[PDB]
Each structure stands twice: as C-alpha cells, then as structure tokens.
Amino acid sequence: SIYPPETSWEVNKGMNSSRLHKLYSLFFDKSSAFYLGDDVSVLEDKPLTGAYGFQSKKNDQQIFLFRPDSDYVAGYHVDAKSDAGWVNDKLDRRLSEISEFCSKATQPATFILPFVEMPTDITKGVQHQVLLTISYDPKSKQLTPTVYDSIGRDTYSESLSSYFKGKYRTTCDEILTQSIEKAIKSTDFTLGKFTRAAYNHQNRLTEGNSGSYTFRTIKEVISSSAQGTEVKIPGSGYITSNSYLTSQHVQDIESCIKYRNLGVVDIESALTEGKTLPVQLSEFIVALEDYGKLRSQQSEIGYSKTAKLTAVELLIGILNDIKGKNEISESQYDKLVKEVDCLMDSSLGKLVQFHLKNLGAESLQKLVLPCVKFDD
Numbered sequence: 001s002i003y004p005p006e007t008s009w010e011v012n013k014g015m016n017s018s019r020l021h022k023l024y025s026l027f028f029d030k031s032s033a034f035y036l037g038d039d040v041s042v043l044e045d046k047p048l049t050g051a052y053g054f055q056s057k058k059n060d061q062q063i064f065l066f067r068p069d070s071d072y073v074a075g076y077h078v079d080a081k082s083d084a085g086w087v088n089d090k091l092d093r094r095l096s097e098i099s100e101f102c103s104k105a106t107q108p109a110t111f112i113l114p115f116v117e118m119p120t121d122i123t124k125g126v127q128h129q130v131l132l133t134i135s136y137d138p139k140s141k142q143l144t145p146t147v148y149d150s151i152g153r154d155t156y157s158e159s160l161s162s163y164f165k166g167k168y169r170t171t172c173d174e175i176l177t178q179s180i181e182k183a184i185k186s187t188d189f190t191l192g193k194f195t196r197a198a199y200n201h202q203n204r205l206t207e208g209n210s211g212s213y214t215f216r217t218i219k220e221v222i223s224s225s226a227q228g229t230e231v232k233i234p235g236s237g238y239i240t241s242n243s244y245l246t247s248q249h250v251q252d253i254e255s256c257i258k259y260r261n262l263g264v265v266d267i268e269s270a271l272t273e274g275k276t277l278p279v280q281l282s283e284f285i286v287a288l289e290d291y292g293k294l295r296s297q298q299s300e301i302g303y304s305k306t307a308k309l310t311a312v313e314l315l316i317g318i319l320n321d322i323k324g325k326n327e328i329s330e331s332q333y334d335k336l337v338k339e340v341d342c343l344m345d346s347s348l349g350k351l352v353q354f355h356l357k358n359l360g361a362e363s364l365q366k367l368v369l370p371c372v373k374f375d376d
Contacts, residue, residue, distance in 0.1 A: 001263065003018055004286070004290060005286060011209045011253060014208060015207070017069055018068075019211075020068040021068045022257060024271055026253075026256060031276075034216075036223065040054040040055060040057060040063055040222060042273055050066055054222065054226075056226035057226070061110065061228075062110075064098075065218065066094070071088050071090040072088065074086070075172070076120070076169050077120060077169065080169055082121060084172075085174070087176060087179040092182075096183045098134055099189070102143065109135070110225040111132075112131065112133055112221055113134075116129055117172045128151065130147055130148065131147065136189075140190065143180070144191075145180050146194075151204075152196070152198030153202070199234040200244070201234070201240075259287050259354045279355065284319060287351055292309055292313070295308060315343060317332075322368065328368060333369075337365065
C-alpha cells in the first residue's frame with residue numbers, strides 16, 4: 001500500500017488513518033518541527049502489536065505509539081436516555097492488549113493511541129479526531145487514561161446546565177471509561193482518574209483540523225513523557241493555539257501529505273529503526289502526475305489548463321529521462337525554459353518548489369542543467 005501525494009489537501013480538509021500514519025515519517029526528520037530523536041530512540045521490539053516502541057534517552061520510560069487504524073472509533077449517543085454508545089471491537093481489543101502488556105511490564109510506560117470520536121444517534125455525520133493516552137506506573141499499579149481534545153470549552157454563553165448534561169452527552173467519555181474498566185477487569189491494576197484535556201478554545205462540527213492538532217499532541221506527549229515533564233497544551237502551558245500548532249508545524253504537515261509518495265513499508269522502516277526518509281526523485285514525478293490528473297478535472301486570469309498540463313507533461317518526461325540512465329537533450333531543455341514560469345506559478349509552483357528544495361537544487365534549470373548534453 002502507498003500514501004500518495006494529495007496535491008490539493010490542506011489541514012482544514014480533514015484527517016484519516018492513512019495520512020495520520022504518513023505524518024509519522026516526520027518524527028525522525030531532523031529538518032522537522034516534530035523531530036523526536038533528541039527526546040527518544042527506537043526500542044526492540046518490545047512487541048506491542050500494532051504499536052511502535054520507543055525508549056527515552058533522558059529517563060527510564062518506554063513510549064508506545066500506536067499506528068493509526070480506521071477501526072479505532074468510539075461512537076457516543078447524544079441522547080442520554082440511550083446507552084453510552086459503542087467502542088469498535090478493535091479499539092477494545094487493544095485496551096485489553098495494553099493491559100496484558102502492563103501485567104508483565106516492569107518499567108513505566110505511556111501508551112499513545114489516536115482514534116476518532118463520533119455521535120451516532122445524531123443524523124448528521126461528524127468525525128472528530130482525538131487522542132487517548134494511557135500511562136502505567138509499575139509500582140502503583142495504576143493505568144491513568146487521558147483523552148486530548150482540540151475542540152472543547154470555554155463553555156459559558158453556550159454550555160449545558162448540569163440539568164441538560166443529564167439529557168445530552170457531547171463526548172465518548174462514558175463508554176470509553178467502561179471499555180478501559182472492562183479491559184483491566186482481569187488484572188490487579190487500580191484505574192487512575194479519567195481526565196479529558198480539552199484545549200484549542202472552541203471549534204464547530206468541523207473537526208476540521210483536529211487531525212493536525214492531535215498529531216501535534218502526539219509529538220508533545222512523546223516529548224513530555226521522555227523528559228518527565230507535564231504535557232503542555234493551549235489553555236494550560238501554551239498561550240494560544242498558534243503557539244502550539246505554529247505555521248511551520250502546519251506546513252511540515254501540509255507538505256508531507258501534499259507532495260510526498262510514501263509506501264507503508266517505508267514508514268514502518270522509518271520508525272522501527274529511527275531514521276529519516278529522504279525525498280527521492282520518483283516522488284517528484286508522481287507528485288506531478290497526480291497534480292496533472294487532478295487538474296485535468298476542473299473547472300470543467302492566469303495560465304490556462306492546457307498551459308499547465310503541457311507544462312507538467314514535458315517536465316515529467318524530462319524527470320523520467322533524467323531518472324534512468326539517462327540524460328536530457330539540449331533540444332528538450334529549451335522547451336523547458338519557456339515553461340519555467342508556468343511551473344512556478346500558483347500552488348503547482350509550491351509543488352515544484354518543495355521537491356527542488358528536497359533534492360538540492362536552486363531551480364529547474366539548475367536541477368536539470370548538469371543533466372543537459374549540448375550539441376556538441
């Protein structure tokens with residue numbers, strides 16, 4: 001399976017398990033604002049199926065980060081006459097696997113699992129991205145569950161009176177606490193206080209960018225567990241959301257999803273042996289081809305559509321020729337210079353600009369010139 005470059009994506013347009021996995025590649029990119037190799041290093045294994053293991057350099061603690069899964073879903077019923085909802089069987093099945101790992105765990109661990117919360121009895125379909133953290137201390141013996149939420153509170157001109165919270169739920173906390181209680185019913189562990197940390201002042205049905213917030217919280221919870229520090233979030237350690245999810249964070253995310261072409265084997269490698277994934281030139285070709293496909297489609301000033309499909313076609317041909325063995329005709333290089341202005345216009349430009357920066361060239365000509373064979 002492959003995580004394509006989705007050239008038109010932006011953070012307000014939502015998350016899914018595949019792209020949240022793709023963003024995991026930035027955890028060992030020293031160039032990225034999400035870099036963790038300072039804070040932790042890879043572990044072996046220590047087999048927690050479906051999770052990546054990490055050992056902190058600074059202290060004793062073990063961090064397990066679960067790979068996103070489209071079945072990590074909890075549904076809650078807004079109507080409080082109904083039952084609290086459902087937790088999908090797979091999410092339940094790794095509350096049980098965490099608890100069995102902890103039953104033999106001998107060093108303290110934190111478990112990080114990104115999942116999706118949704119209201120089922122409301123006709124409207126809304127998905128909301130949240131983060132489950134379970135930390136276990138081998139001497140308590142406590143699992144403390146926490147949910148990080150990027151859309152809740154400051155409540156007031158629009159809260160529920162403690163009457164109406166008896167009538168309506170806004171959260172899967174009731175059924176998720178039940179799931180965790182049932183998962184440790186087997187064991188001897190005492191269950192710590194279930195808390196939900198709601199940050200980023202107030203948002204709508206929109207997640208719509210909470211995928212990006214919970215990815216960011218993932219990096220914050222690994223960093224803070226490695227250094228033995230409280231987790232800091234908006235409204236509790238960070239001034240406002242833009243302190244937390246800064247503009248550099250947003251673009252590290254947007255460039256990863258928009259412009260790279262990663263196979264899941266590459267990401268698994270990247271976090272099972274703690275290494276960066278250098279951008280290769282084939283990705284550039286693929287990114288162009290899917291900017292081409294998606295720009296054929298619409299809108300059916302500026303450069304015409306036929307102008308930029310003729311642009312990217314010729315530039316893909318060049319990059320293919322450049323790729324193997326092979327080298328590029330001088331006749332074809334003149335065609336490209338008269339297309340260079342079109343390649344760098346309007347988002348297609350940011351695509352070209354991204355790859356040029358990640359393959360070490362100042363421009364198209366400087367990228368392709370060492371490659372040209374003049375006659376003669």
